[PDB]
Design a protein around this ligand. Structure first.
Ligand SMILES: *Cc1c(COP(=O)(O)O)cnc(C)c1O
Ligand SMILES: *Cc1c(COP(=O)(O)O)cnc(C)c1O
Ligand SMILES: *Cc1c(COP(=O)(O)O)cnc(C)c1O
Ligand SMILES: *Cc1c(COP(=O)(O)O)cnc(C)c1O
Lengths: 466, 463, 463, 466
C-alpha cells in the first residue's frame, strides 16, 4: 500500500525486468541485422521521447474548436501545431488543404475516409493485392470478403499489365465506367513506380468519383520532393506517419478545401465529413503522445538533412537495383523511381517464399511478394527490398552494393537447399530441411556472421541502446 | 551526413523546443489541477518508458506463430507475454479464455468484435447514451446514424428506469424478443452501479445472442476484485487499457474458449481475423509493452490496495456531497464514480462544468435519467481514479467535495445574475466578465491549485 | 399454316380438355362448399370477361404520357380511367391523392412502397404475425429473415395485448422511439377490429415516419363506408383488388399529394419509379381493366348494400357462435371476420380446420394472442364475404354456425378417441380411418353441400 | 340491393360500356396495325378463356405438397400439370430439372432468383442495357441505382464489342475474376444472336458463380428447337410466358436438380431456395387463372403447328433482314439467328428516336434502341424489329418483304421531316413538326392507309373481335 506511490515512480528496468530484457534483446536484434523490409524505419530519439510524455493522460475527444471536456489548452496548442506542420511540410495552402491528425494508424485513416465519403456498400476501386496493392484498398475472393474494406464496402481491384509491371490505366478507365466507383485509390504496398495521378484524376472525375491517394510508402519521399506529389491531383491523401516519414506509428488524413468545380461553382464538403467519421464516428480519445511524436517527425522532415536523407534513399535503391541487375537478377518494371524494388527470383529458379526464410536466417530482413506474372500466390516469385531503414543508418551506394552481394550469397544458398529437397516438396519441408540440416545450417551461420559484422559498423537510431 | 546522424540521436528538448514546451506546460497543468473526470488517470513511469522503446520500429502483422514477416522472435515473446499477463490478471484459465492484445484503443476493440460476431447490418443492443451508455455501443437519431456502430450495424438502445436510475432489465428482456439482437453489450460510460451480468446472460441466451461486456471503466476495479467480474457470465469482454487499469492508451479483447453448452466456441479465430487482416495493420508493439507493464503492476497488492482506496474515496466524496444536500443518481455508487443531479441546486452540469474548469477543478456534464433535454444536462460525473493515484484519501476527498460545492454556489450566482432564463453563452459572459465573479474564480482557483500541489504527479521525472 | 390459324381461334374446351376439366371440377367444388376463408370472394362475370380481352397483348411499360413504346392510345384511356375510378370510389380529391394501378398483387404493391420510401435496410414496423399481422409486414425469427420485407429491410413487430386482443398502441409508441422506424404499417390479416389510424399517425409523425395502411382485407368495407377510412390519417394506402373489393387479383398504391405540413409530399414520383422501372415490367392491362370494372361495381348502391350485409352476417355468425359457447377474440368484430378461440372447446384450429374441410366447410387456423405455441394455434378465422356474395343472410349464417359447431364437436370426438396427448398426424388418421368418424364426416358433408347448392355461384355462365 | 345478384351476372358489355368500348377500340387498333415490336404477340383464344375461369377465386399460398389452406385438390392438379408440361415442352428430365410456375411475370421471376441465390448486396453480372441487356439484369449510373436489381444487389454489366456487335466474352472472363459475381445472367432484350452458354458456364464455374439464363425473348424458339437450348449449360433458366411462347403474361423459374459436381460429389440446393423465395418470400396467393393460361400455352407449344410457326418466325426475320439490307440498311452483327434484328439507321442519316414516332403514326409499330456504337442514349441509332406478332397472323416471307418496303417508305419520310427541322432541333420539336405540319401529315395519312389495308388482310388471334 505504501509502495504504491513508489511503484508509479519506479523505472522500467527495475519495475519490469522481463519486459525490459525483451526491449534490450529487440534493440540488439535491430542493431546486428540488415533491414531491407520496405516499410521499416527507425524513429529518432526526439520522436520516441515525445511518446513517453504526460500527453498520454489527457482525454480530448473532439477537435481544437470543440472538445467534449475542458482543460485542453495545451492539447489544443499541440494538435493545432501538428496540423500546421503537416500542411507546411507538404507545401499546402491552408485555404486549399486541411488535415486530420488523429488516426491511430494507416489502416484506421483509410477506413475513416471510406466511412465518410463512400458509406456502407459504396463502391471502391484499388490496386489488386497480388499486383502490389494494400489490404485496406480491398481484399476479397469469389467466396469471402476478408478486408474490412471489402466487408463493409463493395470493392473491385484494377490490375497492372503483367508484361510491363505498370498499372494498366486504360483497362481501369474502361472498368470504372461499368463498376461506377464512388472512390478510387492511388497508393501501393509494393510498386516501384510513380503513380499517374493526373490520369487517375481524369478517370475519377469522369465517373464523378473521389480520388484518394494512400501515400503511406512514399510520404517521406514526397516531402523531400524526390517523387511527384499526390497533392496536385487528388482530393484526399491518407498516410501513415512512420515508414518513410520516419515518425511513430499513426496516420493522417489530408483533404481539399474550397472550390471543386465551376459550371456557378460547387465546393468541397470533405472536411466536416472526414472529421465526423474519425470522431465521434470511429475513434475515441486521440493519442496525444502519438500526435506530439508525429509533430516532432514533421519538423524533422522539413530539414535539409531529411531532404538529403531522402535523396540518398532513392540513390541507394538505384545502386542496389543496378548491382542486382549486374548479378543477373530481374527487377520488375526493370527498375524503380522510389525506395524499393521487386526482385523476380524466377530469373534464378526459386521463389520469394523460400528466399525470405533463408535470408532471415542470415539476419538479412526482407519479404516475399508476388510478381505480376505469378500463376499462384502460394509460391510468390518476388522479393521486395526497400532502402529506407539502412539509409537511416548511414549506408551509402558502396554499402548497398556490398548488401546486394550478401543477398546474392543468400539466394545462391536458397537455391542450393531447394535443389536438396525435391520438385514437389512443401514450404514446410523446405523450412524444416533448412533448420535440421547441419550442412545448410553451417552455410547460414557463416553468412550471418558476415552480415552482422558489417551491420554493426553502422549506428542504430533511437534511445541510448533502447 | 554529418548532422543527419545527430538529428536522430538528439534529445526532444533540443530538437523541438516548441513541442517540448507544450509537454512542460501540460505537465504543470496536470499538477496544479484537481482531476475528477472519471476516465482520466496517470500512467506510471515504467509504462511510459516502454512507449519510447525500439519496439516502435518493428512491423509484426499477424500473430505469434502466424506472422507475415520474419524477425519477430522478441515481438513474439512480448505479445505472448502480454497475453499471459492479461489472462492471469483476471484469474482466467487459458483453456476457457483467450485474449487479443492488438486493438489500438477502446473503440477499435469494440468495432473488431462487432465486425467478427455481428457482421454488416447485424443487430446490437446497448445502454442508451443519455442513460449512461457509450457512443460505440450505438448512437443514432430518427434521421441519422452517427456512431460507426450505428452506421455499419443496426443498433437499438435499452434504457434505465428514470425513477431508480437502474437499468430496466425487464423492459430489455421484452424488447430483445422483438428486436432479435445478435449481440448485447454490458458496459457503461456514466453508471455508478454493478451490472447484472447473470440477468443479461439469460436474456442473451434466450435470444441466442452473444453477451459482450465493455468493462473499460471498471477494468481496474475488476482486477482488484472490488466489483463483480464480467468474466463469469459474458462470452466476450472488451476493454481500454488506460482509465482505471492505468496503462497507456490501447485495448484488449477477451473471448471464451472451450465448450459453450456438443457445441463449442468459435470466437477466437473470428475475432483475431477481424482485428487482422480485417481492421488493423501493424500492431503498435511499444503500446503492447506498455500494456504488459501495466498488467504486471495491476497484479500487485499495491494496485489492489489502490483500487480499494478508489472505491472508498468515491463513497466518501459521495457522502460529503449528500450531506451538502446534493442528489446522487441511484443514491450512491458501487464503483469509482457518481453522477450528481444538480437540479437539486437549481442549475445544470453544462454551466457547472465550465465554472469548475475555470477553478481548475476538472469534471464533465452528463444527462441524468430524467432530463427532458440533452441541451441542458442536469448532472456532473465525478470519478476518483485520477486523484487517488495521487494519494488523496477520504479526508482529502471531503475537502474536494467542498471545493466543488463552492464551485456550484458560484455557478448558481452567475445564474441568478443572468436571470431564470438565459442562454449558456450569456452565462459564460457573466462568468468571465464580472468583477465580483472572475474574482470569485481566481480566489477559488488559488485554493484548488495550492491544495493540489500538495500531492505527487505520477509520470516521468521532470518535464 | 392450315391448322395453325385454327389452333389460335379454337375454344378451350376443344383445345385443352384436361385443363378445361380441371376448371369444371374446381367450379363445382366452389359451388357445393361453404367458403368461410376470410380472404376469399367471387369475382363477377363482368370482371372475369375483362381478363380474357385483347388487353393481354399490349406492352405498356411506363405510364400514361410516359410510355416506352407507342400505340398506347387505348391502354392510356384504360389506366387513366382505372385511376379515376380508384380515387372516386374512395371519395379522394385528385389534388390530395394519386394512385398507381400497376401492382401485380397485394404483396408486390407493399414491396414497391418499401422500395420507394424505406430503401435497403430501412426500418419498418408492423403487427406481429401471431397477433394477426401479414407476412409482407415483416417476418423473421432470432436466426433467420423469411419474408422479403425482413430480408431486404429491417423489421420489428408490435404486438396486441393478449388480455384484450387489441393492438397495444402504448407499447408501440414507446418502442417506436427506440427502434426509429422509417415506416409504420396499419393493416392486418386476422384482426376483427378497426385500427386507430389517428393514434398511429401521431406515433408516425412523432418519429418522422410514414404511416402506410394495408387495407387489403377491408378495402371493400371501406368503399361502402361500413368501417372508418384509412385515407383520413395515412400517407399511403396499399391494397389488393380482390378479397372484399371483389375484383381480379391485383394491387393498388394510393398516395398523398399536395402539402404535408412549406413542406410538400414527394411520394408520387418515388412510388411510381419503384413500381417501374424499379420492380415490374409490362403492366397486365387485362387485370387493370378487371380492376376498373370492379371499381365501377364497387360504387353502386348494390355493392354498398352488399357490404352492409357482409358485416351484418359476421355479427350474426358471431352471436350464434357465442350463444353456442364459443369464445371470440376481443369478444366480437367490427368487420367481415372473427377469430374463434377453440380453447373454449378443448381443441385447436389446427385439428378443426382439417375436419371442417373434410365436411366441405372451408376456413383456416390462426393463433390467438395468448397461444404459447404456433405449432398448435387455438383459433379459427371465419369471414363472411364469400358466402354473402352468394346471397346468404343472417338466418343462413346461423345455420352455418351450427354446421361449424357440429364440425367442432366432431373434431373433439376424434380427439377424445386419440387421447389427451397425441400428434396431429395421429388425429388425422383417426379421422380418416374410423368407421363411426369417416361416417360422421360423410353425413355432415352431405348436409353442408345440400345447403350450399341452394345458393348461386357468381362467375361465368357454365364451366 | 336486389340487383346485386344481377350485377354479378351481368355481361361486361352491359355492365361496363366504357371499359367494353376501350377493349373494342384496342382490338381494332391491333387488327389494322403492323406489329413489329419484338416482345409483342397474340395469345390464342384457348389461353384467354382460361384467364376468365373460376380459378381466379381460390387462394392457394404454398405449393402442391404444402398449402396454407385446404380445398386445393384441383388447384393442385393444375399447378402440378403446368409443371409437368413446362418440363416436357423443353425436353427436361424431372430428375435433373424442376420448375416454379408461380411468378407473376418476367421481372418477378428474375427477382425471386436473385433473392434466393444472390441475397442482399450479392454481386450480379448482366449484359449492359445499351448493348441490348434488360433492366432486371442491372441498371445504374455513377450516381444512382435505378433497377431493383441494382438497388438491392450489386450489379456490374458486361459489354458487347462495338465493332462486331457480339458479346465480348474475353473481357467478361477477365472482369469476372475481379468483380467476383455470385451470379451471371445469360439473356437479352435486343440481341439478334445465340448466346455462348458453354463459354458462360466455364466463366461462371471458374468464379464459382451460378449461370442464370433469362430466355424471355427466345423461349418459344427454344421449345421448337430453332435456336440452341440454354438448358444444356445453365443452372437456372427464367422466362416470361408471353412474348415468343405466346401465353398470357406470367413467368417461370426452371432450376437444376441432382448432382452438380464431383471431386465425393456435391448437389444442387436450388429447388428449396427458389421456392421459398417465391413464397413466402416475395409473393402471396398465386394467380391460378394465369397458371391455367400458361398450361394451355405450353400444350400448344408442343404441337408441330407451333413448331412450324417458330421456323416461320425465324425465316421471316431472315427475309425481312435481307430485304432491308438490299434496301441499303445496316443490320447489327450483319444479321440474326432469331426473331429480331437491330437496324442501325445511321446508315440513312437518322435515328430510331425519330423513326419510331413516324412509323407509329403510319401504324407500323416498333421501337428505338441504341446500337453498340452510339455515343449517346438520347439519340439511339437503331430500330428493333421482331417477327413473332405478324407471323402469328400468318405473314410469310413475301409479306415481310412488303413490310420491309413500308418501313423503308417510313424511314424516307422520317428523313424528310428531320431535314425540315434543323441540325440542333430537339426530339420535342421534331414530334411537334410532325404533328402540326399538314405537308408531312399528308404523307403519314397516305402511308398509314396502305399499311392498314395490307394489315387487314390477315386474321387477328384472340376472342371473336375481343
Ligand atoms: C503500410 C501501409 C498501410 C498500413 O498502415 P498501418 O499503420 O499499419 O495500419 C496502409 N496503406 C498503405 C498504402 C501502406 O503502405
Ligand atoms: C472510454 C470508453 C471507450 C473508448 O476508449 P478509447 O480508448 O477512447 O478509444 C469505449 N467503451 C467504454 C465503455 C468506455 O468507457
Ligand atoms: C392478402 C393480403 C396481402 C397479399 O395479397 P396478394 O394478392 O396475395 O399477393 C397483403 N397484405 C394484407 C394485409 C392481406 O390481407
Ligand atoms: C421482357 C423481358 C422481361 C420482362 O417481363 P415482364 O413480364 O414484363 O415483367 C425480363 N427479362 C427479359 C430477358 C425480357 O426480354
Amino acid at each position: 500500500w505504501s509502495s504504491h506511490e513508489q511503484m508509479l515512480a519506479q523505472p522500467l528496468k527495475d519495475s519490469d525486468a522481463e519486459v525490459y530484457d525483451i526491449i534490450k534483446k529487440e534493440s540488439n536484434r535491430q542493431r546486428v541485422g540488415l533491414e531491407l523490409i520496405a516499410s521499416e524505419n527507425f524513429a529518432s530519439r526526439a520522436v520516441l521521447e515525445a511518446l513517453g510524455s504526460c500527453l498520454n493522460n489527457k482525454y480530448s475527444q473532439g477537435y481544437p474548436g470543440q472538445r467534449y471536456y475542458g482543460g485542453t489548452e495545451h492539447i489544443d496548442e499541440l494538435e493545432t501545431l501538428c496540423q500546421k506542420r503537416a500542411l507546411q511540410a507538404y507545401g499546402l495552402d491552408p485555404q486549399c488543404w486541411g488535415v486530420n491528425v488523429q488516426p491511430y494508424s494507416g489502416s484506421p485513416a483509410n477506413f475513416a475516409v471510406y466511412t465518410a465519403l463512400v458509406e456502407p456498400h459504396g463502391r471502391i476501386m484499388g490496386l489488386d493485392l497480388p499486383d502490389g496493392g494494400h489490404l485496406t484498398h480491398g481484399f476479397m475472393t469469389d467466396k469471402k470478403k476478408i478486408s474490412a474494406t471489402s466487408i463493409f464496402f463493395e470493392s473491385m481491384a484494377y490490375k497492372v499489365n503483367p508484361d510491363t509491371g505498370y498499372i494498366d490505366y486504360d483497362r481501369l478507365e474502361e472498368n470504372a465506367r461499368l463498376f461506377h466507383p464512388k472512390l478510387i485509390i492511388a497508393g501501393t504496398s509494393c510498386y516501384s513506380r510513380n503513380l499517374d495521378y493526373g490520369r487517375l484524376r481524369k478517370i475519377a472525375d469522369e465517373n464523378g468519383a473521389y480520388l484518394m491517394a494512400d501515400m503511406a510508402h512514399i510520404s517521406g519521399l514526397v516531402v523531400a520532393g524526390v517523387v511527384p506529389s499526390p497533392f496536385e491531383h487528388c482530393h484526399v491523401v491518407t498516410t501513415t506517419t512512420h515508414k518513410t516519414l520516419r515518425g511513430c506509428r499513426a496516420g493522417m488524413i489530408f483533404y481539399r478545401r474550397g472550390v471543386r468545380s465551376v459550371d456557378k461553382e460547387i465546393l468541397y464538403n470533405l472536411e466536416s465529413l472526414i472529421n465526423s467519421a474519425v470522431f465521434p464516428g470511429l475513434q475515441g480519445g486521440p493519442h496525444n503522445h502519438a500526435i506530439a511524436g508525429v509533430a516532432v517527425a514533421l519538423k524533422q522532415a522539413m530539414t535539409p538533412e531529411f531532404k538529403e536523407y531522402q535523396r540518398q534513399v532513392v540513390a541507394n535503391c538505384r545502386a542496389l537495383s543496378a548491382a542486382l541487375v549486374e548479378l543477373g537478377y530481374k527487377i520488375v518494371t526493370g527498375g524503380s523511381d522510389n525506395h524499393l524494388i521487386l526482385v523476380d527470383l524466377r530469373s534464378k529458379g526459386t521463389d520469394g517464399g523460400r528466399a525470405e526464410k533463408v535470408l532471415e536466417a542470415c539476419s538479412i530482413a526482407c519479404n516475399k511478394n508476388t510478381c505480376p506474372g505469378d500463376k499462384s500466390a502460394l509460391r510468390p516469385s518476388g522479393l521486395r527490398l526497400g532502402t529506407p531503414a539502412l539509409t537511416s543508418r548511414g549506408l551509402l551506394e558502396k554499402d548497398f552494393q556490398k548488401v546486394a552481394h550478401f543477398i546474392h550469397r543468400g539466394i545462391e544458398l536458397t537455391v542450393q537447399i531447394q535443389d536438396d529437397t525435391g520438385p514437389r516438396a512443401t514450404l514446410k519441408e523446405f523450412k524444416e530441411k533448412l533448420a535440421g540440416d547441419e550442412k545448410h545450417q553451417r552455410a547460414v551461420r557463416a553468412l550471418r556472421q558476415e552480415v552482422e559484422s558489417f551491420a554493426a559498423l553502422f549506428p542504430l537510431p533511437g534511445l541510448p541502446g533502447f
